[PDB]
Amino acid sequence: SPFSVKVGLAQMLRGGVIMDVVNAEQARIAEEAGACAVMALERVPADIRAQGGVARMSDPQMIKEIKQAVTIPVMAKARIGHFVEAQILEAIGIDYIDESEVLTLADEDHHINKHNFRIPFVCGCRNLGEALRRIREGAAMIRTKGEAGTGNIIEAVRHVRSVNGDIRVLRNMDDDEVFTFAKKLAAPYDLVMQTKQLGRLPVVQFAAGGVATPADAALMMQLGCDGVFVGSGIFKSGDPARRARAIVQAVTHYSDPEMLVEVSCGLG
Amino acid sequence: SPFSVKVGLAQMLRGGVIMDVVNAEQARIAEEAGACAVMALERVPADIRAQGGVARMSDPQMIKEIKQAVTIPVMAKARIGHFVEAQILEAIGIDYIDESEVLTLADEDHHINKHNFRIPFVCGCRNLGEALRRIREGAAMIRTKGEAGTGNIIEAVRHVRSVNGDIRVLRNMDDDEVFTFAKKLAAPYDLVMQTKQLGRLPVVQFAAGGVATPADAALMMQLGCDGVFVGSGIFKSGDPARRARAIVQAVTHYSDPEMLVEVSCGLG
Amino acid sequence: SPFSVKVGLAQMLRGGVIMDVVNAEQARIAEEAGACAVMALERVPADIRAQGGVARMSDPQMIKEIKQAVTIPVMAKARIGHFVEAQILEAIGIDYIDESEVLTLADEDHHINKHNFRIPFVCGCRNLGEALRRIREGAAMIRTKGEAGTGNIIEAVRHVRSVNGDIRVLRNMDDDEVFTFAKKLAAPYDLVMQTKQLGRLPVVQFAAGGVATPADAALMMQLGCDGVFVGSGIFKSGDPARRARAIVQAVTHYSDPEMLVEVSCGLG
Amino acid sequence: SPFSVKVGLAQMLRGGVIMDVVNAEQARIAEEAGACAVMALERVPADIRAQGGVARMSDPQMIKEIKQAVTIPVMAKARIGHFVEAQILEAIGIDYIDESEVLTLADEDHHINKHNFRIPFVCGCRNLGEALRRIREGAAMIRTKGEAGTGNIIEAVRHVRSVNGDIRVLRNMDDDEVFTFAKKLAAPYDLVMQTKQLGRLPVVQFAAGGVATPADAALMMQLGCDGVFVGSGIFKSGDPARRARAIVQAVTHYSDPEMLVEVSCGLG
Amino acid sequence: SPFSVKVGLAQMLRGGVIMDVVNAEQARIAEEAGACAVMALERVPADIRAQGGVARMSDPQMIKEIKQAVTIPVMAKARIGHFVEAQILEAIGIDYIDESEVLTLADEDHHINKHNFRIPFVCGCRNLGEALRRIREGAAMIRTKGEAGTGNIIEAVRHVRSVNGDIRVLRNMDDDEVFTFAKKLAAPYDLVMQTKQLGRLPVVQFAAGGVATPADAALMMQLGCDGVFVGSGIFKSGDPARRARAIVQAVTHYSDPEMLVEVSCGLG
């Protein structure tokens, strides 16, 4: 299928960090720091909503600027259910669309049908049922919804633990009981059974929302994530290159405390 | 698959009437009247529950007596979730097991995993979501839950209309909206989409529970059922052979009022 | 249209009394007493429900017996929503079908589509909205739901007053306000506007349920009904011929107190 | 009828964009950009209500100025239920009256009787029942109520999906069930049945309220609208001519992502 | 009676506009513009209450100034239940007292006994029952309570429609039912029956509260009012003479759209 191609595409991000960037300068710092992809963002949606505005797809022009500035994959956000925003993003020729709850919802009841696109989608989830629903709709990659722009990892920890815990429950579960389990999750039975066989999520699972420090990033990796997303927080500080490198280093060496000491020492 | 074989098996019952019988005499009357199958029943579960007892699988001996007495397929009831009752019934070599809510529930949370058997199962449903869940569990044939032993068709009409109505809703529905629809039904998405393509249920759909008269049986057929189940009510009356024939005739000639007049004239 | 033909058919009953009969003897007494039609009834539905049973269409045989016994029109009851019962009744060749809430409901959500039949239907109503809904479905004649087999006129008076009162409200109403009025009635606007122009119901309106005495029958006529239905109560008394005649006489001479004295004097 | 003439009048706007304008300068920009009509507006009602004022019909003088400045049809708003505002607008000789919930309600219980006018009316709706009610009152054209002056498309998407979804439900629905369906919609049965036969709304259906970007406009068209309304937002920006052209282009080429990229590139 | 004399006095205002004036200059503009009476007002009660003060009878001196300045009748407000304020107003020799809910209530439970005065009273009402109660107390003229100093006609429309609608209901109503109707209105039966015979209110019925534009004034007249009250809004604008004349012209020519266009064109 093209689906498995998209899934495979997403797997090459495993082990990596993805950074929110608002311009080409930041994008290069990200790339040099060793980010595996960048997320293009006209403005931080936190700030647009804090001022009571609607947060939409970013201007294609500014996305084009970032796509040119770097050789690593570029991602951008479409509003949930806004399949035309996604068509535009596909046509600009970015690598991944993030169907993002951080932007203003466009459809209260329906997500984008992501199978109708040739490029892979990221979606958020709070639990396994939601993850499996996004995947069936054609998401090639899952992140935690976490908590947008607070710096608080508590929500991301809840989500990772929730998802991973249900997968562990599912792995050992009497097969006869999986029907009821699928009902309670309101998830497609066929994806539930596949998740059972795999013993993990059929797609790459990243942590997102709240990851603020190297320690946070490493925690996410130790809890069994495949990678992390980081916000614009990195670039709103001193030596952005250093803070960027630190989080990449944390994710690469997530089980080496000595390394984590080094990258955290003197960050502010 | 063996699944499609079981589904195909069940199609031979299309256009037919299935009658509850409590002995071999009744079974022969049923067969001669033109019933397409019989349902073997130690005792009427209505009466066992009315006297506050538990209603279980029938004695294999009495089932064996009925299997011998007739050449039409024989069905018997297993309690919901009682997979060992089903194993016994399979080994006796009956034709269809009815996983029946009319018997005392054995498992509050789980139905039998019907895929683990080589003979086909009937299950009940009140709506499409329930039907699709029973099918995914491996039911080869669906009936309405209706209302056991009241003679009141109202519940069966509700169920037929409910199921058929949702199928019609599903047939025309924007494909992008079917994901959410599957969530709301708590039904496997893949079976929902298949039902959409077929424009009907993937399995034979019978009416059951409350069908008392020729008019009732014909109504069910006109509402789009593939056949009907009838209770032991038939044999608690004056000329059981006549009443039996009448319901068969009603189902065969369900769109011929003239015929329905004839079979109803002078029944009591 | 055939609709207007059915409406016209029903208008021939204007000024008349319709009597429930359970056999041919009673039917002839009814006819000779001057009833404009008879309602065939295997058994009184009151008694079938009082014993917790289901009340359905009557046996066509006993209906045939009554159709033969008399030259006045014969009516019979179909369960609400039971369109096959109605097909049978049509094919027997009776004159009017009563879609009757006195029988056990067959469809909780839908009435018979009465346009699909060539013979006229009676329906019950409690108010104008309900009346207009039954008419749009193709009822040619409206009766009050009243109160089955209590002998208590209070419900019938409520219904007549309700319907007539809303018609009077409608007759004078600002045309610009009729849209909202139709919304509140949940009735088809086109039938509402027609009722406004006519200043009465587009169909014959009879009183039913609770009419026990000559005084009751005359009251209904004075309140603006076109005729009345009477139950089997008549025949559960002395000189049924006398009691029958009395109600007919009451309806014919409903504004002549002297007559009403005469027919009521010495009845019980 | 004059009704079908008004419906036909409105159909000429199919495929088009209608823009809110507050003066003649803006009106010409709209016309040159390729708008199919303009909506004349003294002031943005959002601002009048935000300052706690009453929003009424616009001054006829300023409407006259805009009618002269352009050759495309002119629309103006009357308060709901304010039939005299509508008479004035008709007499000024504008092309379409919008009975608009964006203005201060004049009649809590009744809309204008739009049949009493010779020029066509637009009304808003949230669902099919409301649409069919406005049409029966004589609206020649339906728009979504959406959400006035937020730039948030979510309400408009809900409304389109709602209306279109119920039409799809209605298209396939058992005819016998349409009576109850009309009751639940509180909509005229005759218009419900007509909508069933047509398989779409008897009138042009436009999207309105929240449409902010080319992507939004195209989404509405992809969801099956016949055209869109846009607010004064367009003219509160740089090169208003460019932003205006962009939305027109988006609606014309709503299924061409490449086009949508071009018109969205560099908009701000 | 003196009552019918007062009623007749009030009828000579039929067809007219009454304007709130706060000085003699405004009073003359009103008179020249063709107002049929003026309402003397020390200060706008809206402003006295907006500043948390009590709004009472106006200073007799300022009322005397207005009575001298014009030859048209002068009205003034007394607080509800404040019969001594009314005695003072009578003694000053004004023409009409308005027992006004716009002023601070003086008696929570009782209105002025208006029969004890030789000059006619105006009272407000929201519905027919309230109107009939005020009349029995001796009001010679009824206005809607509407909504003081908002410019919003919605409340006045509600009241007119309410009153007129109940009168229409009453006109056609079965006489036998009028007793209960009077109970539900908590209105004197004798005035209810009189209103029934007349087919309208026994006294002049004016619209008041919210009438802001010519269109508003004409709407009130088209809904069946006998005249309108207008607030000080007129004089808080440009060319007060023009705006004054416009509303008078609107009420005189309330069914001529062309006229309404002319008087509304260029008002602001």
- Tell me A110's DSSP state: -
Query: Quick check: E83 and E112 in contact, CB under 8 A?
Result: yes
The dihedral over CA atoms of C68, C72, C75, C76, expressed in degrees to the nearest 10, equals -30
Neighbours of chain D (3+ CB pairs under 8 A): A, B, C, E
The values of phi and psi at residue B19, to 5°, are: -120, 135
Neighbours of D61 (CB within 10 A): 14
Contact with chain A for residue D266, Cβ under 8 A = yes
Q: Which residues contact B251 (CB under 8 A, 6 or more apart)?
A: B15, B16, B17, B217, B218, B221, B227, B228
Contact with chain D for residue E219, Cβ under 8 A = yes
The values of phi and psi at residue D21, to 5°, are: -135, 145
Taking alpha carbons only, the member of D208, D221, D219, D96 closest to residue D143 is D208
B148 token code pair = 């056991």
Taking alpha carbons only, the member of D91, A256, C77 closest to residue E253 is D91
Contact with chain E for residue D108, Cβ under 8 A = yes
CA A142 centroid distance within chain:
6
Catalytic site includes residue B77:
yes
Neighbours of chain C (3+ CB pairs under 8 A): B, D, E
Q: How was this structure determined?
A: X-ray
Q: How far is E120 from chain C (nearest CA, A)?
A: 32
> Within D138-264, where are the H helices?
154-172, 178-185, 189-198, 214-222, 240-252, 257-264
* Measured distance CA(C144)–CA(C131) in Å, rounded: 9
Helices D240-252 & D257-264 angle (0-180, nearest 10):
170
The values of phi and psi at residue B183, to 5°, are: -60, -50
* Measured distance CA(D19)–CA(A68) in Å, rounded: 36
Contact with chain D for residue E216, Cβ under 8 A = yes
Residues of C in contact with D182 (CB under 8 A): 188
Query: Quick check: E241 and E218 in contact, CB under 8 A?
Result: no
E37 token code pair = 């009476």
* Measured distance CA(D167)–CA(D177) in Å, rounded: 14
- Which residue is it, tokens 């009451």? C250
Looking at the partner chain, which of B151, B158, B260 has a beta carbon nearest the beta carbon of C88?
B260
Looking at the partner chain, which of D161, D165, D172 has a beta carbon nearest the beta carbon of B168?
D172
DSSP percent split of chain B into helix, strand, coil, nearest 5: 50, 15, 35
- Would you call D59 and E151 a contact, using CB atoms and an 8 Å cutoff? no
* Measured distance CA(D114)–CA(D135) in Å, rounded: 9
Answer yes or no: is C15 a known binding residue: no
Answer yes or no: is C149 a known binding residue: yes
Query: Quick check: B162 and B131 in contact, CB under 8 A?
Result: no
Residues of B in contact with C91 (CB under 8 A): 257-258, 260-261
**Amino acid at position C171, single letter:** R
Of the listed C67, C77, C114, C145, which one is catalytic? C77
The dihedral over CA atoms of E7, E11, E17, E18, expressed in degrees to the nearest 10, equals -20
Contact with chain E for residue D42, Cβ under 8 A = no
- Can you point out the beta strands (E) in chain D? 16-21, 37-40, 74-79, 96-100, 121-125, 141-144, 204-206, 227-230
- Would you call D173 and B165 a contact, using CB atoms and an 8 Å cutoff? yes
Of the listed D6, D67, D77, D145, which one is catalytic? D77
Query: Is there an interface between B and D (3+ Cβ pairs < 8 A)?
Result: yes
D179 token code pair = 């009576």
Of the listed B6, B67, B77, B114, which one is catalytic? B77
Residues of B in contact with A175 (CB under 8 A): 113
Alpha carbon separation from E261 to A121, D103, E65 (Å, rounded): 58, 20, 36
Query: Quick check: A94 and A119 in contact, CB under 8 A?
Result: yes
- Would you call B257 and C90 a contact, using CB atoms and an 8 Å cutoff? yes
> Within chain A, where are the H helices?
2-11, 24-33, 45-50, 60-69, 83-92, 128-137, 154-172, 178-185, 189-198, 214-222, 240-252, 257-264
- Tell me A54's DSSP state: -
Neighbours of C122 (CB within 10 A): 27
Query: Quick check: D155 and D135 in contact, CB under 8 A?
Result: no
Resolution (Å units): 2.5
**Amino acid at position D78, single letter:** A
- Would you call A56 and D212 a contact, using CB atoms and an 8 Å cutoff? yes
Q: What is the interface size between C and D, counted as CB pairs within 8 Å? A: 45
Of the listed E6, E67, E77, E145, which one is catalytic? E77
* Measured distance CA(C216)–CA(C132) in Å, rounded: 26
- Which residue is it, tokens 């917790």? C52
Q: What is the C-alpha radius of gyration for chain D, rounded to an integer number of angstroms?
A: 18
- Would you call B179 and A136 a contact, using CB atoms and an 8 Å cutoff? yes
- Would you call C106 and B153 a contact, using CB atoms and an 8 Å cutoff? yes
Residues of E in contact with D56 (CB under 8 A): 212-213, 215
- Would you call A179 and B109 a contact, using CB atoms and an 8 Å cutoff? no
- Per-residue burial over D68-106, b if 16 or more Cβ lie within 10 Å, else e, is ebbebbbbbbbbbbbbbbbbbbbbbebbbbbbbbbbbbb
Q: Which residues contact C214 (CB under 8 A, 6 or more apart)?
A: C246, C247, C249, C250, C260, C263, C264, C267
Looking at the partner chain, which of B113, B176, B180 has a beta carbon nearest the beta carbon of A176?
B113
